[model samples]
Target: RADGRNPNQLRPFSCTRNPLDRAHGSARWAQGDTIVLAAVYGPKPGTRKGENPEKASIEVVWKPMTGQIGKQEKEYEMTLKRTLQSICLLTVHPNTTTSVILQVVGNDGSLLPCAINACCAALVFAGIPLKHLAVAIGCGVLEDGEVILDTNKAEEQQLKSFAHLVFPNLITSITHGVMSEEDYFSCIERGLAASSRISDFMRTTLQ
Candidate 1:
């Protein structure tokens, strides 16, 4: 066993909607202690100087609970922007913009996946067009070959490698740090098996 539990035991998850009424759409999602709040705005006027008229553009802004923005935070924003662009149906709202603001109120672990879940939920509440519904989870492979699902901060430090994976698709899973391919794929398979549970929870919450 890893992390004092079964290797496949996922942490508790919850999504709360409409945290802020002012936002067109808003949601707060939690993966264990890593809670993230996402607010969606627009389909209003496009503020950027220039944008493609053929499709809508998405902007992501990430804010942490404390401290100035750093290189890693900036990267997080960029990665989120790209990921959203992949699943969001921008063509439906051509020449417009949708802004997603994600704030990290807690960062126990799996913060990136929490942001992704919040983003997806807020977009749905905002009525923004989406090509597909997506969910994400965190995975880690220990040096001893035990795979941990939904790793927390403590487990992260002890992991040989870690990755954030997306549901229905692992090709876009943004992985970081170091690990072996055998372990990576093994961990990834478990994530795929657990993905349906995540998707079901999201659907039930939205319903």
Candidate 2:
């Protein structure tokens, strides 16, 4: 709505793989003005105690462009770790560890999904085993009862409510503000098609 695009329209997007020299796999993902870098390394032998020896373990690190790492970043790291872990073929690299590092190059809003999308590609490029790809999307509901897709910062602040969702396999989501169940389901429905487009883009990029 703010950028002269339809409410269902996504911001322009671009992704590249192997943008790093030493990492096992690296990717950069950008949507509108938000950009993120993801680097994958290790599946190296050994894991600390508490990890299941029958499956690989996933560790995630989040680096912001500035400011100290706070609760927000910590939560992001946990979220990314779990989401990536679920999609990964942990059993394929049992007793080992695969680490994913995410760097925030820019923040125009919809940051988490950008980071998740980046990590997905980085994992693929790194040749890490995977069950399937996961796609994420952000949706905002305006005060006047319209749901907007892929909002930027200024628009995010003005929205009545919003949600971030991960699609395919299992649907995982987080939301803010009170919404009717109908609207939340609507977000899921809208996300389905949009996420497919993103998944398709990712497939083409990887190819």
Candidate 3:
């Protein structure tokens, strides 16, 4: 799968900044077979949802894979919110919320990273002040001990586990998490190395 590329090879990628109107900022990005669209709305008021804090709130919404929101969609939303909150510069837009909505038109395997990349591009397009760009990549570890990059759905099913590597700067400040501990460390090591190179491609493409 993955176009017969090496385990470290990232899919071909393209990004368009400000691909939408009406939103503060937006971006559309595609990595080989995976495609995602991210739209950023507000530094706006928090409307009576809860005690409005001074920190900017991040919300991530994912459309259903096929029809309407379901269990999987909810899970993705929760995970995305948690991941994005850890990275976004919330203090810059305190007492407000920044909404990121991602629609997956084509999901091969690296869906989460694709979403993160799209979000990063949208944040940049919005001119949101940030210490660094948030970049992400996925790595799949097959049961047979083969590591795969940018896995598609079929390959993902064969994976014993997966890792999502998130980096703040292209050159440094990277953080990561894995779905399981079976081969987490080694997989991340490979993923980090792969991600570093992919980060370079992302930077160049965006520029």
- After TM-score superposition, the amount by which residue 55's alpha carbon in candidate 2 deviates from its true location, in angstroms, is 1.1
TM-score to native of every candidate shown:
0.93, 0.95, 0.84
Put down candidate 2 lDDT per residue, 12-89, tens digits, no spaces: 889877799999999989998999999999588888797777778888989987887788777878788888988898
Local accuracy of candidate 1 as per-residue lDDT tens digits, 1-207? 444667787788887778898899998888878999999995876647777767788889999778967898888788788888888887788778888999999988888877887898898889998888777878888777777788888887777687888774253687777767887788778888987778787678565
Q: How large is the C-alpha RMSD of every model relative to the true structure? A: 1.7, 1.3, 3.6
lDDT of each structure? 0.81, 0.85, 0.71
What ranking emerges by lDDT with the best candidate at the front?
A: 2, 1, 3
Tens digits of lDDT, candidate 3, 32-107? 7788888888677773368457777777788755788777667666767766777678778777777788887788
Worst 10-residue lDDT window for candidate 2 reads: 168-177
Model 2 RMSD, rounded to 1 decimal: 1.3
User: Which residue pairs show backbone clashes in model 1?
Assistant: none
Report the Cα lDDT for residue 130, model 2.
83
Better of 1 and 2 by TM-score: 2
| Whole-model lDDT, model 3 | 0.71
